[PDB]
């Protein structure tokens, strides 16, 4: 990103729980699987819905 | 007139959280308090150390804390002030202070915000702005190069962005430790 | 400043003095570069000034 | 002096700096030569004819 | 009106100068002008112009000079004879 | 490093200076570092290129240029990547020979480490084959640093020499690094590594 | 086709030079064509 | 030639010179010469 700089501490959780991610840094070793197929996407978003409802 | 405070009154006890690296300052403090005992075997002291850390880390007082531990003449002023809007007098303060140090040794020079002089000359700014900045930075180069380890004067630079430093001040034998 | 213009002036002039002769400027790319519309640096000033002198002399 | 010091500095700075060849470089009695002609150039037949004429 | 003191006004960008260092000189001038008329209030509208953060603008030299000169002016300010400096701006977090 | 500067034409000036003094002191050997930082492709890019490539073409008129020769001096340049240099610079006729300097080989490390011990107080139970087959992948400066840490740790330990184990540790610390981990997180590490090893 | 007036001046000058190369002091028509042929190689 | 009037010629490069205190005077000079010599026509090549 075209970043910034502020005098703030680390956010309560959302910036502190971002410590478990390991983002990607080099561009030529990025993996992105082929996007799902709107019949697989149906079942995956349905799993998301089940989690939220529970 | 250059801000030279005689004896400081800032101690090695009144800064906390930097113990591991503090050793360096303590070691340097012995060299400058006793410049002849390192003339014993020839242990080479630092030409000048540039204190680095993003602002708020205390780069100014911990240098002044070295000054307080040694009670040596502490010479401080802002490097950014070495480029006032008049050509030729920026370098004048440089020479003045360096002969002041060579006279009131054993002393320690400190100039926070010198990378304002040592940030790499931009390819987008006005030359007239960079010309006397060029002249002042070359004054500092040649002067502190003209310094000997035996003059008993330690140099301290301070800034927050090490990456913007130009490779001329990044020379070993000019700024040995960082 | 002005030194490049005086230099090309002296070159072309003394060349005209000992005519007929031959001039050879290898790598005019550093001097005959197309003038841009951006950049207020002295280098551009001296370069295009030498370019003007080069022009008015050769024509 | 005080005035023509900078005149000398100028015409030194603003002197001719082109190397002169095929004129009498008789500082010692020489004349600078390059030493290649239209025979030690093998390939640009068209260019050599153009410059010959 | 309740300080019984003198009021002085100017704008921030007034210190930005196309001439190098003249910002620093005019900073000095304003500071001594107010110093000789103590006690007083020195109110500065358009404050974030001069009090802008470092590096966030293309005026490193000039703004850097402005801020360091003003701070070293009010750093060694121990002879405050009842004066105040009131800088007004909308973004308190973007301050240096 | 002294060839990069933004004032008017000084790069070409210092180039002419180095080359004409090398012609005067001829024969000679002109070695130059930092060639990739200056000898990049001539194009628009930034404003600095109105100066930057200027210097470059002055360079170009010193190697071959006019004058048809000077003596036949040797000009050598150190650069990390040849693919980034200008086209005119890398042409046969300005840089005749081109040799690669890779990282030390097996026997390369064998010899480079042992020539780095006559300057070290060392013992006699030293067989360099283990180190050569153990330090594979490092550069020469890293081998010298290995010896430096070995000597300094020998000093800080209270001994007078360095033997097998000494070097082994030194290189093991230079390669696999040297932070706290809780005993609760440590068991996760153990379980996952043990499962991967059992599977494989 | 595709030329300009300046190129026409240059081409007739090239034809003059081509006739002079042939030793003839009278520029003939083929010199015109000759121009196009020497620009090609 | 058809209008039957005097003609003058100049060029953009001339008036252009980086040193100070010239251009305005050269332009005033050219125009006063033209005025005193009117009618006329001042061809000036490469105006840009
Ligand atoms: N590492 C530190 N340990 C303790 N106090 C510190 C430390 N760094 C800064 N301070 C505090 O910062 C204040 C001094 O700040 P100041 O004199 O303005 O120098 P500074 O600006 O913080 N150093 P710098 O960031 O390089 O400009 C005091 O209140 C110190 O206690």
XYZ file of C-alpha atoms and ligand atoms in Angstrom:
760
model
C 0.000 0.000 0.000
C 0.929 3.677 -0.252
C 1.171 3.798 3.517
C 1.016 6.453 6.223
C 2.306 7.078 9.756
C 0.458 7.902 12.977
C 1.196 8.181 16.702
C -1.230 5.433 17.730
C -0.679 2.174 19.579
C -1.658 -1.242 18.252
C -5.371 -1.867 17.858
C -7.148 -3.844 20.574
C -7.435 -7.129 18.694
C -7.735 -6.668 14.941
C -4.179 -5.400 14.604
C -2.921 -7.597 17.433
C -4.570 -10.767 16.145
C -2.990 -9.969 12.787
C 0.199 -11.396 14.294
C -0.739 -14.914 13.201
C -0.922 -14.399 9.447
C 2.472 -14.393 7.683
C 1.510 -12.304 4.638
C 3.089 -12.679 1.218
C 6.156 -10.577 0.453
C 7.759 -11.608 -2.866
C 5.571 -11.501 -5.952
C 6.964 -14.461 -7.870
C 6.080 -16.994 -5.166
C 2.408 -16.093 -4.710
C -0.154 -18.879 -5.017
C -3.757 -18.303 -6.044
C -5.860 -21.311 -6.874
C -8.394 -21.101 -9.695
C -11.516 -19.327 -8.507
C -14.502 -21.532 -7.630
C -17.350 -22.180 -9.997
C -20.547 -20.648 -8.570
C -21.743 -24.126 -7.682
C -18.783 -24.653 -5.401
C -19.038 -21.038 -4.305
C -22.612 -21.794 -3.275
C -21.552 -24.500 -0.831
C -18.625 -22.516 0.545
C -20.641 -19.381 1.250
C -23.245 -21.662 2.774
C -20.614 -22.916 5.215
C -19.856 -19.307 6.131
C -23.569 -18.760 6.740
C -23.790 -21.809 8.985
C -20.907 -20.560 11.127
C -22.444 -17.107 11.510
C -25.863 -18.487 12.400
C -24.505 -20.838 15.039
C 26.717 30.897 19.805
C 26.993 27.098 19.839
C 25.059 25.386 22.647
C 27.904 24.032 24.806
C 26.810 22.971 28.287
C 29.725 22.647 30.721
C 28.779 19.695 32.931
C 25.577 17.879 32.114
C 23.703 16.425 35.076
C 22.158 13.599 33.040
C 23.191 10.158 34.261
C 23.454 6.586 33.031
C 20.774 5.805 35.628
C 18.140 8.167 34.180
C 17.662 6.208 30.941
C 16.109 2.750 30.910
C 15.356 -0.031 28.461
C 18.617 0.096 26.493
C 21.008 -1.807 28.789
C 22.230 -4.343 26.204
C 23.581 -1.722 23.741
C 24.423 0.743 26.593
C 27.786 -1.126 27.004
C 29.114 0.682 23.867
C 28.540 4.173 25.421
C 30.110 3.021 28.760
C 33.179 1.639 26.881
C 33.519 4.895 24.839
C 33.194 6.839 28.115
C 36.307 5.074 29.465
C 38.266 5.791 26.276
C 37.484 9.488 26.426
C 37.950 9.815 30.194
C 41.370 8.127 29.877
C 42.607 8.681 26.309
C 46.095 7.457 27.212
C 45.137 4.007 28.503
C 43.859 2.993 25.075
C 47.104 4.425 23.727
C 48.497 1.466 25.700
C 48.020 -1.230 23.051
C 46.443 0.918 20.330
C 42.763 -0.044 20.568
C 41.115 2.102 17.902
C 38.317 4.328 19.248
C 35.310 5.326 17.130
C 35.761 8.323 14.854
C 32.109 9.184 15.461
C 28.913 7.230 16.054
C 25.619 8.255 14.444
C 22.784 7.539 16.890
C 19.878 5.966 15.012
C 16.265 5.473 16.004
C 12.847 6.699 14.993
C 11.982 9.845 16.940
C 10.966 9.563 20.561
C 13.629 6.962 21.358
C 15.691 9.555 23.233
C 18.687 9.789 20.883
C 19.401 13.262 22.252
C 19.572 12.645 26.001
C 21.364 9.279 25.952
C 24.144 11.054 24.085
C 23.849 13.835 26.653
C 23.837 11.007 29.208
C 27.258 9.930 27.933
C 28.179 13.594 28.299
C 26.940 13.591 31.893
C 28.804 10.414 32.806
C 32.014 11.904 31.416
C 31.407 15.550 32.507
C 33.178 16.458 29.250
C 32.342 19.500 27.090
C 29.116 18.616 25.310
C 28.620 20.377 21.966
C 25.070 20.293 20.605
C 23.210 22.059 17.810
C 20.823 21.098 15.025
C 22.328 19.913 11.762
C 19.344 21.364 9.897
C 20.572 24.778 11.073
C 23.768 24.302 9.047
C 21.758 25.413 5.969
C 20.250 28.798 6.879
C 19.084 30.849 3.916
C 22.444 32.535 3.255
C 25.183 30.889 1.162
C 28.594 30.338 2.744
C 27.861 30.830 6.445
C 26.437 27.353 6.982
C 29.920 25.846 6.794
C 31.257 28.623 9.027
C 29.562 27.192 12.116
C 30.999 23.760 11.263
C 34.609 24.948 11.391
C 33.944 27.114 14.445
C 32.580 24.151 16.401
C 35.302 21.765 15.259
C 38.090 24.069 16.427
C 36.077 24.615 19.625
C 36.170 20.845 20.122
C 39.869 20.552 19.277
C 40.464 23.273 21.889
C 38.169 22.134 24.737
C 38.971 18.439 24.377
C 38.431 15.968 25.832
C 34.969 16.855 24.547
C 32.075 15.187 22.743
C 30.298 16.761 19.759
C 26.607 16.042 19.180
C 24.510 17.119 16.204
C 21.015 15.705 15.990
C 19.199 16.049 12.653
C 22.337 15.910 10.518
C 20.834 13.530 7.970
C 19.004 16.686 6.916
C 22.492 17.388 5.532
C 23.222 13.727 4.808
C 20.055 12.688 3.001
C 20.996 11.797 -0.568
C 20.877 14.845 -2.856
C 17.479 14.676 -4.552
C 17.024 14.438 -8.320
C 13.885 16.636 -8.135
C 14.802 19.651 -5.970
C 16.423 22.974 -6.802
C 20.216 22.982 -7.127
C 20.378 26.363 -5.372
C 18.797 24.619 -2.399
C 21.208 21.675 -2.697
C 24.343 23.655 -3.614
C 25.030 25.132 -0.175
C 23.760 21.944 1.441
C 26.375 20.217 -0.726
C 28.984 22.736 0.460
C 28.082 22.298 4.134
C 28.033 18.497 3.996
C 31.424 18.487 2.283
C 32.666 20.852 5.004
C 31.586 18.282 7.598
C 33.146 15.426 5.620
C 36.532 17.093 5.186
C 36.627 18.555 8.703
C 35.763 15.434 10.702
C 38.118 13.566 8.369
C 40.827 16.032 9.389
C 40.190 14.854 12.955
C 42.565 12.418 14.655
C 41.634 9.763 17.236
C 44.211 11.387 19.543
C 42.467 14.770 19.639
C 40.172 13.306 22.293
C 36.905 14.381 20.656
C 34.068 11.924 20.006
C 31.440 12.794 17.401
C 27.746 11.960 17.765
C 25.273 12.197 14.905
C 21.579 11.504 15.384
C 18.714 10.903 12.990
C 15.780 8.531 12.619
C 16.035 7.323 9.002
C 19.318 5.531 8.325
C 18.266 4.492 4.813
C 18.253 8.058 3.456
C 21.899 8.552 4.473
C 24.333 9.125 1.622
C 27.176 6.563 1.315
C 29.832 9.213 2.006
C 28.932 9.478 5.697
C 28.439 5.696 5.613
C 32.220 5.279 5.251
C 34.157 3.213 7.816
C 36.765 5.456 9.354
C 34.272 8.328 9.209
C 31.328 6.776 11.073
C 32.683 3.474 12.362
C 29.852 2.328 14.650
C 26.106 2.926 14.394
C 27.470 28.873 -16.736
C 27.979 30.006 -20.323
C 31.152 27.945 -20.633
C 29.680 25.336 -22.982
C 28.378 28.015 -25.336
C 31.754 29.757 -25.405
C 33.433 26.405 -26.036
C 31.314 25.489 -29.056
C 31.699 29.082 -30.232
C 35.496 28.854 -30.102
C 35.498 25.427 -31.744
C 33.269 26.426 -34.659
C 34.940 29.820 -35.027
C 38.531 28.634 -35.268
C 37.246 25.861 -37.520
C 35.803 28.539 -39.802
C 39.157 30.323 -39.596
C 41.183 27.410 -41.016
C 38.657 26.467 -43.697
C 38.221 24.100 -45.422
C 38.279 21.624 -42.532
C 36.270 18.874 -40.852
C 34.611 18.895 -37.435
C 33.651 15.643 -35.726
C 31.606 15.562 -32.530
C 31.256 11.946 -31.466
C 28.223 11.245 -29.279
C 26.241 14.447 -29.787
C 23.496 12.586 -27.918
C 24.767 14.210 -24.724
C 24.692 17.666 -26.328
C 22.147 17.468 -29.164
C 19.447 15.960 -26.987
C 15.902 17.140 -27.613
C 14.934 19.972 -25.269
C 12.273 18.852 -22.804
C 9.471 20.964 -21.307
C 10.180 19.926 -17.693
C 13.107 20.459 -15.342
C 14.337 23.722 -13.860
C 17.880 22.549 -13.161
C 21.028 24.419 -14.257
C 22.191 21.421 -16.274
C 19.303 21.788 -18.701
C 20.090 25.498 -18.927
C 23.690 24.976 -19.977
C 22.866 22.026 -22.231
C 20.235 23.804 -24.298
C 22.340 26.979 -24.333
C 25.171 24.987 -25.881
C 22.521 23.562 -28.207
C 21.443 27.047 -29.296
C 25.057 28.011 -29.930
C 25.664 24.789 -31.874
C 22.603 25.588 -33.986
C 23.254 29.254 -34.770
C 26.862 28.385 -35.607
C 26.131 25.497 -37.945
C 23.425 27.426 -39.763
C 46.424 41.820 -11.131
C 42.779 41.816 -10.023
C 40.715 42.197 -13.215
C 42.370 39.907 -15.785
C 42.894 37.036 -13.347
C 39.312 36.017 -14.074
C 39.756 36.779 -17.776
C 42.580 34.234 -17.850
C 40.552 31.785 -15.753
C 37.670 32.290 -18.181
C 39.436 31.767 -21.483
C 41.169 28.786 -19.867
C 37.799 27.368 -18.799
C 36.302 28.524 -22.110
C 39.162 27.426 -24.370
C 39.062 25.164 -27.385
C 39.377 21.525 -26.338
C 38.978 19.691 -29.655
C 41.928 17.493 -30.569
C 43.458 18.829 -33.789
C 44.583 16.281 -36.376
C 46.239 16.577 -39.806
C 47.584 20.023 -38.899
C 51.253 20.624 -38.181
C 51.627 19.587 -34.531
C 55.136 20.995 -34.790
C 55.540 21.725 -31.085
C 58.247 19.110 -31.650
C 57.968 18.749 -35.444
C 55.077 16.315 -35.777
C 51.509 16.277 -37.084
C 48.940 14.049 -35.387
C 47.716 11.204 -37.598
C 45.045 8.522 -37.248
C 46.599 5.953 -39.573
C 43.619 4.225 -41.184
C 42.393 4.736 -44.743
C 39.738 3.423 -47.113
C 41.539 0.069 -47.355
C 41.603 -1.075 -43.722
C 37.763 -0.732 -43.621
C 36.214 -3.972 -45.027
C 32.406 -4.164 -45.365
C 30.753 -0.730 -45.681
C 31.325 -0.609 -49.500
C 28.426 1.864 -49.914
C 29.578 4.217 -47.167
C 33.183 4.185 -48.361
C 32.055 5.068 -51.888
C 29.877 7.889 -50.578
C 32.724 9.418 -48.596
C 35.245 8.805 -51.376
C 33.213 11.033 -53.645
C -10.085 41.068 27.124
C -9.698 39.151 30.401
C -5.914 38.840 30.275
C -5.361 42.587 30.296
C -2.725 41.866 27.671
C -2.033 42.684 24.034
C -3.385 40.606 21.154
C -1.365 39.724 18.048
C -2.560 37.880 14.942
C -1.056 36.387 11.783
C -1.420 33.328 9.549
C 0.657 30.165 9.295
C 1.601 30.128 5.615
C 2.934 33.663 6.171
C 6.165 31.942 7.236
C 6.526 29.831 4.085
C 9.144 31.553 1.934
C 10.352 31.150 -1.635
C 13.649 32.393 -0.177
C 15.589 29.896 1.928
C 15.930 30.620 5.630
C 13.920 33.848 5.470
C 11.198 31.777 7.079
C 13.608 31.211 9.958
C 14.480 34.913 10.085
C 10.825 35.958 10.121
C 10.184 33.373 12.831
C 12.947 35.049 14.828
C 11.470 38.469 14.078
C 7.947 37.580 15.187
C 9.295 35.886 18.310
C 11.365 38.892 19.374
C 8.509 41.255 18.453
C 6.261 39.405 20.880
C 9.080 39.053 23.429
C 9.555 42.810 23.715
C 5.798 43.316 24.276
C 5.332 40.831 27.095
C 2.910 39.875 28.467
C 0.625 39.164 25.506
C -1.203 36.484 23.532
C 0.100 35.348 20.144
C -2.691 33.611 18.226
C -1.827 31.815 14.985
C -4.567 30.750 12.600
C -3.731 28.380 9.732
C -1.462 26.582 12.174
C -1.198 23.191 10.480
C 0.589 24.895 7.573
C 3.693 25.703 9.625
C 3.069 22.952 12.175
C 2.781 20.275 9.508
C 4.347 16.863 10.043
C 7.782 15.997 8.699
C 8.167 14.268 5.346
C 4.429 14.328 4.608
C 5.043 17.370 2.368
C 7.471 18.163 -0.451
C 9.039 20.979 1.623
C 11.526 19.041 3.765
C 14.159 21.782 3.878
C 11.772 24.713 4.336
C 9.233 23.220 6.738
C 11.994 21.436 8.650
C 13.772 24.782 9.048
C 10.548 26.470 10.143
C 9.759 23.898 12.822
C 13.266 23.508 14.219
C 13.824 27.270 14.354
C 10.493 27.864 16.078
C 11.099 25.084 18.594
C 14.638 26.183 19.459
C 13.113 29.639 19.838
C 10.464 28.402 22.269
C 12.677 25.646 23.686
C 15.026 28.113 25.363
C 12.002 30.279 26.102
C 12.407 30.668 29.845
C 11.658 34.413 29.885
C 7.905 33.928 29.415
C 6.595 37.067 31.122
C 2.966 35.947 31.100
C 2.621 35.488 27.345
C 0.929 32.589 25.564
C 1.098 31.033 22.103
C -2.233 29.769 20.764
C -2.034 27.803 17.531
C -5.373 26.956 15.918
C -5.917 24.029 13.566
C -8.501 21.412 12.675
C -6.293 18.283 12.644
C -4.647 17.833 16.067
C -3.453 14.318 15.218
C -1.573 15.214 12.026
C 0.581 17.550 14.134
C 4.285 16.864 14.541
C 30.856 6.368 -5.092
C 32.877 9.448 -6.052
C 31.398 9.286 -9.565
C 27.804 9.890 -8.408
C 27.123 13.615 -7.936
C 24.500 16.050 -9.217
C 26.583 19.186 -9.860
C 27.195 20.330 -13.413
C 29.312 17.883 -15.379
C 31.657 16.807 -12.580
C 31.219 13.101 -13.304
C 32.706 13.409 -16.778
C 35.380 15.638 -15.248
C 36.512 13.010 -12.742
C 36.357 10.375 -15.497
C 38.644 12.414 -17.746
C 40.881 12.976 -14.719
C 41.243 9.302 -13.810
C 41.766 8.304 -17.431
C 44.289 10.999 -18.367
C 46.330 10.402 -15.222
C 46.296 6.668 -15.965
C 47.510 7.526 -19.469
C 50.299 9.637 -17.984
C 51.341 6.917 -15.503
C 50.896 4.244 -18.192
C 51.207 1.323 -18.172
C 48.593 0.846 -15.446
C 45.478 -0.986 -14.257
C 42.268 0.993 -13.727
C 39.900 -0.966 -11.482
C 36.456 0.511 -10.775
C 33.667 -0.631 -8.442
C 29.974 0.265 -8.280
C 29.543 -0.010 -12.055
C 25.917 -1.182 -11.937
C 24.827 1.904 -9.982
C 26.096 4.229 -12.746
C 26.240 2.139 -15.917
C 22.513 1.559 -16.223
C 20.460 1.824 -19.399
C 20.407 5.289 -20.928
C 16.778 6.413 -21.020
C 14.457 9.106 -19.725
C 13.474 7.873 -16.275
C 14.174 10.670 -13.822
C 15.741 14.082 -14.234
C 19.129 12.850 -12.984
C 19.617 11.031 -16.291
C 20.287 14.361 -18.006
C 23.485 14.172 -15.934
C 23.781 10.468 -15.119
C 24.145 9.113 -18.643
C 26.250 12.155 -19.549
C 29.034 10.853 -17.309
C 28.424 7.429 -18.851
C 29.094 8.546 -22.408
C 32.263 10.275 -21.245
C 33.196 6.847 -19.918
C 32.366 5.478 -23.354
C 34.785 7.882 -25.048
C 37.663 6.899 -22.764
C 37.763 3.131 -23.340
C 37.532 3.262 -27.136
C 36.504 6.816 -28.068
C 38.739 8.679 -30.493
C 42.575 8.805 -30.342
C 42.455 5.227 -31.693
C 44.460 4.084 -28.631
C 46.456 5.411 -25.688
C 48.787 2.545 -24.686
C 46.617 -0.540 -24.311
C 45.934 -0.071 -20.599
C 43.800 -2.622 -18.771
C 40.442 -1.386 -17.474
C 38.607 -3.687 -15.078
C 35.195 -3.218 -13.535
C 33.321 -5.017 -10.771
C 29.550 -5.404 -11.145
C 27.046 -7.837 -9.661
C 24.841 -8.311 -12.733
C 25.894 -7.996 -16.363
C 22.287 -7.986 -17.611
C 21.708 -4.490 -16.199
C 24.705 -2.747 -17.741
C 24.409 -0.512 -20.787
C 24.589 -2.098 -24.220
C 27.553 -0.030 -25.405
C 29.522 -0.789 -22.232
C 29.370 -4.589 -22.449
C 30.325 -4.711 -26.136
C 33.373 -6.709 -27.332
C 35.955 -4.003 -27.881
C 35.418 -2.117 -24.616
C 35.409 -5.102 -22.228
C 37.181 -7.930 -24.046
C 37.024 -10.633 -21.369
C 34.235 -11.552 -18.970
C 34.797 -13.983 -16.105
C 32.393 -15.193 -13.426
C 33.136 -15.323 -9.700
C 30.738 -17.806 -8.120
C 30.573 -18.891 -4.502
C 33.466 -21.130 -3.386
C 33.310 -24.781 -4.429
C 33.810 -27.821 -2.202
C 37.590 -27.820 -2.614
C 37.277 -24.057 -2.947
C 36.008 -23.903 0.621
C 38.573 -26.549 1.597
C 41.397 -24.206 0.580
C 39.745 -20.894 1.509
C 39.202 -21.979 5.111
C 42.712 -23.364 5.620
C 44.445 -20.302 4.185
C 42.390 -18.445 6.818
C 43.987 -20.177 9.829
C 47.695 -19.306 9.656
C 46.452 -15.988 11.082
C 44.720 -17.957 13.867
C 46.081 -19.827 16.904
C 44.725 -23.290 16.160
C 45.213 -26.888 17.293
C 46.412 -29.870 15.271
C 43.351 -32.152 15.474
C 41.723 -30.298 12.572
C 40.449 -32.083 9.458
C 39.141 -29.482 7.025
C 37.042 -32.041 5.121
C 34.243 -31.865 7.697
C 34.109 -28.068 7.474
C 34.237 -28.063 3.672
C 31.370 -30.560 3.552
C 29.616 -28.638 6.336
C 29.896 -24.980 5.237
C 28.379 -25.502 1.792
C 26.499 -22.455 0.557
C 28.354 -19.567 2.187
C 30.478 -16.850 0.595
C 34.119 -16.160 1.401
C 33.380 -13.204 3.667
C 31.133 -15.514 5.679
C 33.964 -18.019 6.119
C 36.207 -15.201 7.338
C 33.431 -14.154 9.711
C 33.204 -17.744 10.933
C 36.902 -17.640 11.796
C 36.426 -14.247 13.466
C 33.639 -15.514 15.715
C 35.675 -18.643 16.476
C 38.618 -16.557 17.687
C 36.450 -14.147 19.663
C 34.549 -16.963 21.376
C 37.863 -18.662 22.153
C 38.911 -15.422 23.841
C 35.615 -15.024 25.732
C 35.765 -18.685 26.833
C 39.219 -18.575 28.439
C 41.063 -20.992 26.145
C 44.002 -20.431 23.771
C 42.989 -22.439 20.682
C 40.031 -23.685 18.621
C 39.428 -27.331 17.690
C 36.741 -29.475 15.960
C 33.723 -28.622 18.172
C 34.732 -24.940 18.255
C 34.338 -24.425 14.474
C 31.200 -26.678 14.345
C 29.395 -24.377 16.815
C 30.661 -21.250 15.033
C 29.285 -22.370 11.660
C 26.123 -23.767 13.271
C 25.463 -20.345 14.769
C 26.319 -18.552 11.520
C 23.927 -20.743 9.526
C 20.930 -21.725 11.669
C 20.653 -18.467 13.623
C 20.442 -18.169 17.389
C 13.720 -15.355 21.753
C 11.509 -17.207 24.235
C 8.876 -19.866 23.539
C 6.330 -21.041 26.074
C 6.083 -24.655 27.120
C 2.528 -24.675 25.796
C 3.472 -23.623 22.292
C 6.516 -25.915 22.306
C 4.360 -29.030 22.417
C 2.554 -27.945 19.247
C 5.909 -27.718 17.483
C 6.873 -31.132 18.793
C 3.620 -32.815 17.765
C 3.647 -31.412 14.242
C 7.323 -32.202 13.588
C 6.960 -35.706 14.974
C 3.912 -36.333 12.801
C 5.635 -35.100 9.643
C 8.692 -37.234 10.377
C 6.616 -40.325 11.118
C 4.677 -39.885 7.878
C 7.753 -39.295 5.723
C 5.175 9.255 -53.035
C 5.266 10.350 -49.412
C 7.992 12.960 -49.896
C 8.164 16.641 -48.958
C 9.539 19.697 -50.730
C 12.774 19.511 -48.747
C 13.228 15.898 -49.817
C 12.635 16.935 -53.430
C 15.403 19.526 -53.179
C 17.674 16.921 -51.607
C 16.838 14.376 -54.294
C 17.628 16.720 -57.159
C 20.911 17.611 -55.435
C 21.658 13.892 -55.106
C 20.919 13.532 -58.813
C 23.348 16.359 -59.560
C 26.027 14.587 -57.523
C 25.242 11.291 -59.256
C 25.665 12.864 -62.684
C 28.916 14.471 -61.542
C 30.131 11.051 -60.379
C 29.534 9.838 -63.943
C 31.782 12.667 -65.162
C 28.944 14.167 -67.217
C 28.453 17.907 -66.799
C 24.817 17.572 -67.942
C 22.417 16.003 -65.447
C 20.287 13.426 -67.247
C 17.026 11.789 -66.229
C 18.473 8.492 -64.983
C 20.343 10.327 -62.220
C 16.904 10.963 -60.719
C 16.293 7.216 -60.652
C 19.914 6.735 -59.592
C 19.137 8.709 -56.429
C 16.461 6.210 -55.357
C 18.835 3.337 -56.044
C 21.706 4.561 -53.884
C 19.458 5.431 -50.944
C 18.282 1.811 -51.052
C 21.597 0.009 -50.524
C 7.254 41.106 -53.940
C 3.590 41.256 -54.961
C 2.670 43.700 -52.213
C 5.754 45.707 -53.168
C 7.009 46.264 -49.620
C 10.327 46.050 -47.783
C 11.101 42.786 -45.987
C 13.094 42.004 -42.863
C 14.191 38.650 -41.498
C 15.175 37.342 -38.074
C 15.031 34.065 -36.079
C 13.838 32.801 -32.670
C 17.318 31.734 -31.496
C 18.623 35.328 -31.561
C 16.406 37.044 -28.965
C 16.817 33.879 -26.898
C 19.802 34.083 -24.553
C 19.906 32.954 -20.938
C 21.795 35.986 -19.628
C 19.747 38.902 -18.333
C 18.850 42.303 -19.723
C 18.749 41.613 -23.474
C 15.498 40.240 -24.880
C 13.209 43.186 -24.146
C 15.717 45.645 -25.600
C 16.225 43.564 -28.752
C 12.463 43.324 -29.280
C 11.952 47.056 -28.772
C 14.810 47.706 -31.199
C 13.356 45.457 -33.882
C 9.936 47.026 -33.607
C 11.142 50.629 -33.657
C 13.254 49.856 -36.721
C 10.178 48.380 -38.389
C 8.082 51.406 -37.439
C 10.586 53.859 -38.881
C 10.797 51.685 -42.019
C 7.065 51.064 -42.471
C 5.370 49.632 -44.461
C 7.219 46.357 -43.989
C 6.876 42.699 -43.057
C 8.988 40.997 -40.399
C 9.459 37.334 -41.189
C 10.665 35.536 -38.082
C 11.541 31.869 -38.485
C 10.962 29.236 -35.802
C 8.748 31.481 -33.707
C 8.298 28.731 -31.105
N 14.735 5.427 25.879
C 14.207 6.311 26.731
N 14.185 6.005 28.047
C 13.662 6.886 28.904
N 13.126 8.081 28.652
C 13.161 8.360 27.339
C 13.671 7.548 26.340
N 13.536 8.163 25.103
C 12.965 9.307 25.380
N 12.706 9.494 26.714
C 12.076 10.658 27.322
O 11.998 11.681 26.349
C 12.174 12.970 26.977
C 13.329 13.692 26.332
O 12.977 14.034 24.981
P 13.875 15.041 24.158
O 14.846 15.793 25.073
O 12.991 15.926 23.367
O 14.752 14.122 23.212
P 14.025 13.240 22.157
O 13.347 14.123 21.162
O 12.965 12.351 22.874
N 15.133 12.268 21.367
P 14.768 12.253 19.718
O 13.549 11.287 19.467
O 15.949 11.766 18.943
O 14.387 13.715 19.247
C 12.340 12.697 28.471
O 11.101 12.842 29.157
C 12.844 11.255 28.496
O 12.492 10.595 29.707
